[PDB]
Write a protein that binds this ligand. Sequence first.
Ligand SMILES: C=CC(C)(C)[C@@]12C=C(O)C(=O)N3/C(=C/c4c[nH]cn4)C(=O)N[C@]31N(OC)c1ccccc12
Ligand SMILES: C=CC(C)(C)[C@@]12C=C(O)C(=O)N3/C(=C/c4c[nH]cn4)C(=O)N[C@]31N(OC)c1ccccc12
Ligand SMILES: Nc1ncnc2c1ncn2[C@@H]1O[C@H](C[C@@H](N)CC[C@H](N)C(=O)O)[C@@H](O)[C@H]1O
Ligand SMILES: Nc1ncnc2c1ncn2[C@@H]1O[C@H](C[C@@H](N)CC[C@H](N)C(=O)O)[C@@H](O)[C@H]1O
Lengths: 394, 394
Amino acid sequence: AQKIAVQKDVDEVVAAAQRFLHGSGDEAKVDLQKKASNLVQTIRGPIPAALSSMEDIVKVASLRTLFEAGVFHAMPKGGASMTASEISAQTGLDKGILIRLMRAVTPLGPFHEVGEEEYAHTPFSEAYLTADIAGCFPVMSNFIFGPVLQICDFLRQNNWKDAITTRNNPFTLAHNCPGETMFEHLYKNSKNVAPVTKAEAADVDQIAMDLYPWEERLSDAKGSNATLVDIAGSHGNGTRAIMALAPKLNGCRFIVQDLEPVIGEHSQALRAEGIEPQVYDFLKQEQPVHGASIYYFRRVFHDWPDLPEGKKILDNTRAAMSREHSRILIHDIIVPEIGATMSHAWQDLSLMAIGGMERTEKDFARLLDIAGLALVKVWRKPGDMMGIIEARLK
Amino acid sequence: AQKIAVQKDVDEVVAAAQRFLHGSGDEAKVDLQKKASNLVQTIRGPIPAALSSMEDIVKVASLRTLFEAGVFHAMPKGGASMTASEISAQTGLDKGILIRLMRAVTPLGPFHEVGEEEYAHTPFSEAYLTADIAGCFPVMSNFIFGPVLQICDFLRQNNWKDAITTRNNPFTLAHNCPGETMFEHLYKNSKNVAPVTKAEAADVDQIAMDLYPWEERLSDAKGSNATLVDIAGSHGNGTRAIMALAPKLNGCRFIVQDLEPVIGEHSQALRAEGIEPQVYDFLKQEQPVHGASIYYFRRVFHDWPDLPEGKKILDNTRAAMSREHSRILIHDIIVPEIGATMSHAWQDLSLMAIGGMERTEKDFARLLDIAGLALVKVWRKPGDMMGIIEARLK
Ligand SMILES: C=CC(C)(C)[C@@]12C=C(O)C(=O)N3/C(=C/c4c[nH]cn4)C(=O)N[C@]31N(OC)c1ccccc12
Ligand SMILES: C=CC(C)(C)[C@@]12C=C(O)C(=O)N3/C(=C/c4c[nH]cn4)C(=O)N[C@]31N(OC)c1ccccc12
Ligand SMILES: Nc1ncnc2c1ncn2[C@@H]1O[C@H](C[C@@H](N)CC[C@H](N)C(=O)O)[C@@H](O)[C@H]1O
Ligand SMILES: Nc1ncnc2c1ncn2[C@@H]1O[C@H](C[C@@H](N)CC[C@H](N)C(=O)O)[C@@H](O)[C@H]1O
């Protein structure tokens, strides 16, 4: 047979493993994870591997059900087992459904099938209980997955032309709410604000904030100029990072603006840590606080297309700047023009469903020129997916 | 670090590989594919691996869009490349959308990113163009995936109780058609009949038909008794298999019954190969042809719950039998009670969305007793997922 295929792929895994296990602080790790995948695919063969999409779908379905139904929380941590019966008992999910669902997440899924109707946690299932995953994953599976699946349906309505807008997209199609942006439609139900703000807090790859010199720029600023605004700062974790990074400071104003339901959830937590909670909308208003150090956008612009909303953000902010004292900092993923990762692809293509997108370097170039903005410098410590786009008035 | 984790998992892959590469005609292969997956998961780590559900989702989305938009067919086979521009040109899918979508299916996806806006087929993407995958995959992604994703939503409506029925399920919820069974709602639009009949024809794991002695049983039958009926035979590929298996025959009637839109698509193809195309409905009618060799159900019962429809099938067929001359053959997956595969899980849990299910041996036991039917013998050549349930009147 073509068992030969397996050998070559095993060899490469073995090879790539050896490399990974004697480098330092990267390409090695990614390459090995890639050669590891090739093996699985090669073992299965092209035709059986095409069935992976169906397998993948039920697994995401069943994981989502199980997590919502309280199964992850009812099951004992540390790998102690529990029965179908005892689980169903504590959650009220149909023991027959639960048994069937479990089959999707034991054979390889993050659970362990100890024995007949007997299941256990592993660290991979327990990872779904951590702040990052537990804040992120439910929101995505309740509100985003179904839309991403309907991308095909939306573009088919336009004979594969790009009709996507912020208010007419696979999200509005799937949740039947044409005209509303994703945020608008979620915040209308107030029960959603807390989960969504937690999801907005999720930072799985640990964003690097020592990427650009805060201490230097902010404390070379005299008086009213010395003040940073985290626009759409949400929680404010970005601000707190910055503040931690430079305490080499005087009395410096630190403001976190965002919509009202967001400002509610985090306000007095922010007053506490010493930050001004300001309610602001960069779509219906011009930027209030004038002539500041820098106006800082973190994981904001990828929510938006270049026009209309993209230009209006930067235009409503040009209003309150200073030709040479203020500066603008966009902090977001910079997609390579070749060799994108699945980390790149899943964030970008999810946004696609709500009319957002992740931007190339040349994509950020277009955005700046459109708003008559001059690129000062792009900060990136490569081996790191996010850079900062620094810019000024032309 | 815990680079140790990678080593142990590499070792096991290497080990399981060596075993697989000196067995014969199985557990070896599955175990290696399992240890291969562990490695990928271990390399990524529990928290980053939880993000695999999001990655998996966009990949299925983007594959579905690309295949529908005609990209798989526009691209040259054999690994010759083609540009974003030349592809968009031949399909009219937005070159900007196409570029973004491609990122989900190059890094590991079945395509190869030759260079900037330059992509190529590999045998893994070309596999999507084969009869099995190309008949199966579109139907699933258009009609089934979205429902499977909404399993959680449906059961949440019932506080995780099992409300699922053949006409009230995640399918009726997602496609908004409460009251219709999956088949009813698809056949209402006649453009769907041809794709769905091709999907029904899909047989990816190559079902074993030499599993039970046709030559022996059929040709020990005198006269009007000697006649087999493939109920819901669709295409009739099952019948043709059987006929090929025994030509050691006299003039033996071979009938393939199914609903009308199915009988249309395949009728004169079946008359041709010498088979009686009969229109029949085992929900609204009793079984016409009386006292036959055997009544044969292939990949039928997993479309149905035990009651109502399950019992009514066997009851409408008991009508036309012979206490000791006729026999009933259910041919379907037999789920193990432990160590289910993802192959088991994806078929069962998809059905779950339309109120169907795959059955245990003890599950088939319940079904038989409920219809007052006696188990003669279960045929299985293990290492093979499907058996036959042979049964008679009690
Ligand atoms: C789900 C709601 C939001 C959290 C608001 C989110 C919006 C953001 O602006 C954002 O930063 N996000 C995430 C960051 C992250 C990075 N590592 C772990 N989490 C994230 O998962 N989901 C989102 N995201 O991004 C891919 C979305 C995609 C489609 C709709 C909405 C969003
Ligand atoms: C999609 C429509 C059907 C083909 C009618 C199908 C019904 C069957 O009875 C069947 O046998 N099927 C398949 C067999 C197969 C085995 N290996 C490759 N294909 C299959 O994919 N899809 C289905 N299937 O089963 C998991 C479904 C699941 C949910 C709804 C409908 C179905
Ligand atoms: N019209 C709007 N005006 C101002 N902020 C908005 C608007 N729409 C959405 N947002 C906020 O943009 C933020 C997007 C967040 N994902 C980013 C928050 C934060 N900068 C972070 O990096 O995590 C949310 O907090 C939104 O509430
Ligand atoms: N009420 C019904 N009565 C008779 N056949 C039905 C009914 N509903 C669905 N079917 C058929 O059941 C079959 C299910 C197929 N997946 C199986 C066909 C074939 N036995 C095979 O193994 O591939 C389809 O051909 C349906 O048209």
